[PDB]
Amino acid sequence: PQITLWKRPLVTIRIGGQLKEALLDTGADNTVLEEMNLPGKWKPKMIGGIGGFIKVRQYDQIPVEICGHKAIGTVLVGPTPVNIIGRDLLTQIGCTLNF
Amino acid sequence: PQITLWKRPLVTIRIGGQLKEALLDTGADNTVLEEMNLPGKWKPKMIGGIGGFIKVRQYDQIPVEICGHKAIGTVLVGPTPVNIIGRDLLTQIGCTLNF
Numbered sequence A, B: 001p002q003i004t005l006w007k008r009p010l011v012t013i014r015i016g017g018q019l020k021e022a023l024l025d026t027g028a029d030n031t032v033l034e035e036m037n038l039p040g041k042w043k044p045k046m047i048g049g050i051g052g053f054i055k056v057r058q059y060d061q062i063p064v065e066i067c068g069h070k071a072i073g074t075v076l077v078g079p080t081p082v083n084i085i086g087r088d089l090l091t092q093i094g095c096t097l098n099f
């Protein structure tokens, strides 16, 4: 699809049977999701945003379905203001900026 | 143009004859630029993301050129680590997300 930006680019994602709302975020290198349980091993990591650094749990090779499009990659889970889909997964689904 | 997300979507902008590199950022509601001393009046605001909030100044109607496309709007200015072009100005230059 083509998505204009007069509103926030919020889409429904599927991740582990759960349906969540997430923001398509071309400004994020990495996908970061709000607090949730995911299966498998994870590693403690840190990531920085506009306001400073946070602690996150890194889960590897997690599938997310983003508007019908499949992605599988590394996901970070921690105190983000909203679920954000970054460039890591936006590239997987074929996403570009056009003007 | 069509802009890939393999790398950070950095483009050249011009504001008051300052040429800067800025991020085309669909996750950002509003444009925020690195600290600079613009003329004119402003209001103080706070914006939040990963790590929490920072304090910024919102200036009134400034022309900004983004890859040769004219925009004009309020802009936020403060201690952001990167220049960020938000939806407020992405809509003005005809930017969409496509996949």
Ligand SMILES: CC(C)CN(C[C@@H](O)[C@H](Cc1ccccc1)NC(=O)O[C@H]1CO[C@H]2OCC[C@H]21)S(=O)(=O)c1ccc(N)cc1
Residues within 6 Å of the ligand: A023, A025, A026, A027, A028, A029, A030, A031, A032, A047, A048, A049, A050, A051, A081, A082, A084, A086, B025, B027, B028, B029, B030, B031, B032, B047, B048, B049, B050, B081, B082, B084, B086
């Ligand atoms: C978290 C979003 C909902 C909002 N952010 C825009 C976002 O694109 C920032 C924009 C950004 C980009 C770089 C540095 C700081 C902020 N990205 C970001 O925090 O991504 C993080 C996850 O991947 C990592 O790669 C980039 C930083 C990490 S924000 O920077 O906090 C922000 C909030 C409000 C406005 N008006 C403008 C920007």
